[PDB]
Design a protein around this ligand. Structure first.
Ligand code: FME
Lengths: 46, 271
RNA sequence: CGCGGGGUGGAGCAGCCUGGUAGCUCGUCGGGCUCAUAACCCGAAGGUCGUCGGUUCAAAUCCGGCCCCCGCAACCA
RNA sequence: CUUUAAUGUUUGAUGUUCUAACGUUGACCCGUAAUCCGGGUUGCGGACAGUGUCUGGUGGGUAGUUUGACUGGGGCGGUC
RNA sequence: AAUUCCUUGUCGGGUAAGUUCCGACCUGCACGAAUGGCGUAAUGAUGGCCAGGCUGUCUCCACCCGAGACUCAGUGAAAUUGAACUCGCUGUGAAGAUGCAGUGUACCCGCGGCAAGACGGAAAGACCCCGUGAACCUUUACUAUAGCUUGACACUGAACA
RNA sequence: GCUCGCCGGAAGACCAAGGGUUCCUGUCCAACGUUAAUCGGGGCAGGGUGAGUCGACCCCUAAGGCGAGGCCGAAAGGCGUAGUCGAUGGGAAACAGGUUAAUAUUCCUGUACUUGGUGUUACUGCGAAGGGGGGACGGAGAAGGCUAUGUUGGCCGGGCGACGGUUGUCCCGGUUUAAGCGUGUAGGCUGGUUUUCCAGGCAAAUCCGGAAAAUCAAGGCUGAGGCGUGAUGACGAGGCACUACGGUGCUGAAGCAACAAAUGCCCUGCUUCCAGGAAAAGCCUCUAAGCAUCAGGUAACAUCAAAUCGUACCCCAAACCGACACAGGUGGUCAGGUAGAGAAUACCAAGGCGCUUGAGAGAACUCGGGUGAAGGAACUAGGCAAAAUGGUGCCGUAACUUCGGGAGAAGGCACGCUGAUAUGUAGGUGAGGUCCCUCGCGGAUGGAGCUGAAAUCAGUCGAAGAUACCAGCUGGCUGCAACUGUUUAUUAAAAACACAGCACUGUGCAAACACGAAAGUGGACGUAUACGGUGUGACGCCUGCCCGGUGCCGGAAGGUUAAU
RNA sequence: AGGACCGAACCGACUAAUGUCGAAAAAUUAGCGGAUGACUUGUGGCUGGGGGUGAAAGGCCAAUCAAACCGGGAGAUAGCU
C-alpha cells in the first residue's frame, strides 16, 4: 500500500517554508501566532 | 480525398480519411513557427471555464497572414503545407522580395501559381483586393470586419461568403450560416472559396481519435446526480424537466443573442 | 375483504347536483319511392329509472340496506 | 354645450441628418529594447450603446424555513 | 420479455423426471419507435441453459506429506469482569431460573477437546416509532434572492420633417 | 574452519529521493532485540566524509510563481507589462591502475583535456539591450555495420590422482589493458564557385532570403567501429621471503586467433504514417551608435587561476513511507553459463543470505499439498473448487458474416538417442595467394578454417521422447451491451459511463457560455466544414398519430399594468 | 497499419481459500484482465470547501466527505437519557 505521506524536501519547503509563509498577509499573521505562543520550530526549513 | 479504410480490426472499420498526396511531406518553414501552450479549458483564475477540453497531440502555432498588407508585389505559391490548427490548409507563399509568408489556401490552386494583392490586382482566386473593387455576386472568402482588422469571416475549410448588394459606402454579404450582414465597403478580402471542402467527410472511427484530437468525454446530464446537473436524479431514466444547460439556462430553443451595439449591421437573421 | 362512482325504453349514453316536468342516436312497427332490397322520406309506439325500505305534499333524483359492475388500496419491519 | 379654425404658446411621439460628449478587444506614432497601460493624430460608431439610482416581470441558479394531532404500533381511511 | 400480477398460462422440443432454458401461441394486469423500435458478425474476468472431456464436488471417505495444535525451556499479551461456597428437573416469577419452592442427584482439584446455555463478547439497534431533532435533495409549498430582462431619470447634444 | 540448503532479471552490485552518523575501531550488557547474548543498526570513548574535470552552485529558458509602474477593488486584495525566479530539459572539460580498520573518477603513479585573466610576440578593422544561422526535437518499422559480452581454439603455467581406467584428440586456471591524440572508414546528408542587382529581415549589413549570369565538377558537412599510440608501463596464475600466523615485503610467465552477438552504439540517421510532433542561451556569422595613434580581435608560447557546498553508510530496505527490527509500497542503471523464442522458467556464476526463539512428540481438529479402488456432477443456489487442456511443424476446419472474420474452430498425426545421406549438409562468416590501383581502413577473385539449420533412411531404449519446470479446456442455443476502454481507493467492474455516428438548438466575433463584485482571461491566438448545450449510442430496416396541459419561439389590435 | 492477437516487465483487481484481538487499519496464495496505447510513470506546477474535480459513484479531496481539517462564536441548543 502507498501510504499518504510522500517525502519531498523541495515540495515541503515551497509550500510551508519561511519565505513561503512570509509571502502573504495570512502567513505573516500565522507566524505572529506562533511567536506569541512561544513555539520553537517556528516554520519548517533546514 | 474520400479514401476508405479496410475493416481489419474493430474501430478500424468505420474509419474514412481525407488523405491528400499534395501536401508537403517535409517539416514546416521554421521562421514562421511559435509554440502554443494548451490549457484544458482553464482560465487564469485556475478554474475550468469550458468543459471537455484537454489532452491532444502537441502542436506549434504556424503564423498566418490575414491582413495581407503588402500590396502590388507579385508572389508565387511555393508549396501547400498542413496545419493542425485550422481545418483549412496553409500555403507557403513566396513574395517577390524574399519575404516568405503563410496564407490560407483557397480552392484548387496549386503550388506554382502566381498571386498578388492590392487594388490594381486582377480577379483571380487567392488574389486580394477591397470589396468595393469587387463585383456584386461573386463569392469571396477571408472577409475583413474593419479596415485593417485582418479578416475574420468564412475561413474554415470550405466556408465562403457571397457578395450581395452595393449599398453606397456599405456592402452586404450572405454568410455561410445564412445570416446577411452589412459590412464596411473599404474592407478587404480574398477571392474564391476556402479549399479543403471535403473535410466534411472526415470520420474519426475509434473513440481514441477524438482524444488525441483534443476533446474529452462528454457526460450526459441525466446520468449525473441531481446535486450536479439540473437534469440529474431518477431511479433510472426519469425525466420531464424542460431540458436545460448545466446552469438552468433553457436550451433547445432560446435566443441568447443580445448585443444591441451591432443590431445596425445585421440585416436579416440567419435562415 | 376496505374506499370512490355508476346502474335510465331492445343497445350506448343524457337529466340526477336544487324532489314535481324523463331526452338523444341507433333499433322496431306501418306507409311511400323501386321490378325487389339497401339507401332516403313521412308518421307512431316504446322506460319498472338495479331491488326493497325511508323522509316528504309527492322520490329517477336526497338518506339507508342488500345485489351487481368498474377502478384504486390492501403497504414498513 | 358638440366638436370644428388659424397663429403664437407648453411640451410630447417617433423618422432623418450632423458631431462635440461617450465606446473603439481598428491604423500608425511616442513614452519604450513593451501583444499591458496612458498620451497623440486618423477612421468607424454616435447621443443609441453601456453604467448608477428607481421599477414591473422572470427567476429551486441560490438561501432560510414550513409541511398538525388522536390513532388498540405507523401509514391510508375517518375525525377535531 | 431484464416488462405477464393471475402463472409452474397453453402446445411442442430437450428429460426417466425440467417452477429454469429453447421455439411458438396473443388472454400486452402494466412493450413500442431517438427517455429510440426490431435485428445484428465480432468482442465479454457478463446472465441463463445443454452436451463432451475431466476429475474426491459427491456416493463414502481411506492413507501419506509438511506447518500449528500437544509436552519441556525462555518471553509473554487481549476483549471481559457486582460478589460468588457457579448441578438436573417440575412449577413459580417483570410471564424462558445456577441462585425462589419442592424433589432428585452429586467425593476435592486439574489436563486435552466440543460448542447447548450463562437472553455469551463486540457497537447508548442503522429496521419501527418519537422529538413542534439535523442534514442534504425535489417541485406548478411560502418568503426572499444572484443573474437575465423592461421602463423612467442622470451620464446626455444640436438642427429639420 | 568444514560440509548443507536458498536467491541469482535477485533475496547481487551502483544512484536519486529521503533519512541524518545507522559507516569503522575499542569497549560495556542494566534498558532496546518478541529467547539467551560474549553479538548488534543498543549505551559509551575515538576515528572517519580531501574534486578546475562527477554533482550542486552558475549561464539559459517551459509549465507556473512574483511583479516597478498600470488597470481594477468597501479595506484586505485581484490580474497583469518591462522584468525577475523556476528544472523534471539545453550548456566547458579525466581515464586506467594501486592504496584504508572506513574515503576515492577527489589521495598517490602514469597519461591528458577544458574555460578564462595577464603578458611577450607575428599580425589584423573591432563593435550591441540589434538581424540571420544554429540549438531544435513525434510514433511505428526495417534491416545494414559494429562493440559490450560470451563460446571455442592456440599458447603459457600447474596436475596425472583416496575405488575400476586416465601422457592423453586428457583435467583446472589465466589468456587483461582506458580516456585522450593520430587516422577520417562502414554508412548518411547536400551539387559546388565567382560576379552583378534587389520594393525582404522596425535601422544598417560584406550575413541570411530572393533574381539572373557565367563557370566547375565534384567540393564540402556529419560520422560507429577498426588499425597505431598511450603501454620495453600496469594487471597478472602461482611461487619466493616472513607470519603479529589476520596478512604482508618482494617477484612475476602467456598475454593471440576464429566465430556468435545484443533491447547498447552509428541513429538528436533512412523509409513511412498520421494525431503533424518546446523555449532560450552558449556557439557561428553580419552590421548600428561609437573608436581608430590605440583600443579590441586571431594564432603560437610563457605564467597564473578554476572559488563555495555535497562526498561516510542505507538506498526494492531492520536505516525511506507504513505506530514496531512489520510477508506491504518506493523512480533510473549493470544484468553472466547451459536449455529455451525469451528479461518466462529450471539448475548454476560472481556476490549475498538461512528470514532474532528453540528441543521433542507424531492425537483429534485446522491450514498448504500428494495419491486413490468402481461409479463419474448423483454434490450444489451454481461443476464453487479441483482435475483436466497446454509446445513446434504439417494436413485439415462449419453455421453465420459487415467478407477482415468465426479460427489456434473442431480434429489428427509426427517428436529421444546413434550412425549414414554428408570421416557435418544447405546456409552464414571468411584468411592465404593472385590481378588491379584514382594507394588505403581500397576494388575483384579465390577459397582453407570456423560455425552450423531442417530433413530422409536404418537400428536401438523405455510403460511413457513437446517426458521435468513451463505450458489454451472445447462445442451448441440465447438475453443484454457494438467493440479496446472507464467506474463505487477499503463488500457492487456490470446490462452502469464513455465511445465513434446521428438529430435538435444556441452563437456573425468585444461570439454564445463560463470563472470573476471589477479588470481581465478561457472559448480561440479559433471564427458557422467553427464552437457550446441537450438527447439517443457502431452498422442494417426504420422512426407513425396528437399543439389539448407544461415549456419554448414568432405576432401585435385591444384589455390590464409599475416607477413617473 | 492496427484503441489487432498470445504473452513477462509494468498497471489493474474477476473468482476461491487463508486472515479476519492479522504478517497487514484491504494483504497473502493460486488462478485472472490489459499489456504501442483512451497506455503507464518520475520530477515540478495549477484548481479548494455548497467550492474544487469527476469516461458520473453523489465517488475523491492526507486512513476522515449527501458538504474536509484547525481555531473561534461556544459552557450553541437538548420538552430526551
Ligand atoms: C428487518 O428486515 C430487520 C433487518 C435487520 S438487518 C440487521 N430484521 C430484524 O430482525
Amino acid at each position: 500500500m502507498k501510504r499518504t505521506f510522500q517525502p519531498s524536501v523541495l515540495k515541503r519547503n515551497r509550500s510551508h517554508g519561511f519565505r513561503a509563509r512570509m509571502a502573504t498577509k495570512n502567513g505573516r499573521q500565522v507566524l505572529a501566532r506562533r511567536r506569541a505562543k512561544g513555539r520553537a520550530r517556528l516554520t519548517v526549513s533546514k | 480525398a474520400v479514401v476508405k479504410c479496410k475493416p481489419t480490426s474493430p474501430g478500424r472499420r468505420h474509419v474514412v480519411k481525407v488523405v491528400n498526396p499534395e501536401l508537403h511531406k517535409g517539416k514546416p518553414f521554421a521562421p514562421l513557427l511559435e509554440k502554443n501552450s494548451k490549457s484544458g479549458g482553464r482560465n487564469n483564475n485556475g478554474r475550468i471555464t469550458t468543459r471537455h477540453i484537454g489532452g491532444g497531440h502537441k502542436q506549434a502555432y504556424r503564423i498566418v497572414d490575414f491582413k495581407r498588407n503588402k500590396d502590388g508585389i507579385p508572389a508565387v505559391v511555393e508549396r501547400l503545407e498542413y496545419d493542425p490548427n485550422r481545418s483549412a490548409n496553409i500555403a507557403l507563399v513566396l513574395y517577390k522580395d524574399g519575404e516568405r509568408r503563410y496564407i490560407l489556401a483557397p480552392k484548387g490552386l496549386k503550388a506554382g501559381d502566381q498571386i498578388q494583392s492590392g487594388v490594381d490586382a486582377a480577379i483571380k482566386p487567392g488574389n486580394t483586393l477591397p470589396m468595393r473593387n469587387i463585383p456584386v455576386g461573386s463569392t469571396v472568402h477571408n472577409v475583413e470586419m474593419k479596415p485593417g482588422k485582418g479578416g475574420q469571416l468564412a475561413r474554415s475549410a470550405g466556408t465562403y461568403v457571397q457578395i450581395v448588394a452595393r449599398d453606397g459606402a456599405y456592402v452586404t454579404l450572405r454568410l455561410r450560416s445564412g445570416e446577411m450582414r452589412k459590412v464596411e465597403a473599404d474592407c478587404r478580402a480574398t477571392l474564391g472559396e476556402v479549399g479543403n471542402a471535403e473535410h466534411m467527410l472526415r470520420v474519426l472511427g475509434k473513440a481514441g481519435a477524438a482524444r488525441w484530437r483534443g476533446v474529452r468525454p462528454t457526460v450526459r446530464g441525466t446520468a449525473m446526480n441531481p446535486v450536479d446537473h439540473p437534469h440529474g436524479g431518477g431511479e433510472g431514466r426519469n425525466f420531464g424537466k424542460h431540458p436545460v444547460t448545466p446552469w438552468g439556462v433553457q436550451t433547445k430553443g432560446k435566443k441568447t443573442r443580445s448585443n444591441k451595439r451591432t443590431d445596425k449591421f445585421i440585416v436579416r437573421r440567419r435562415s
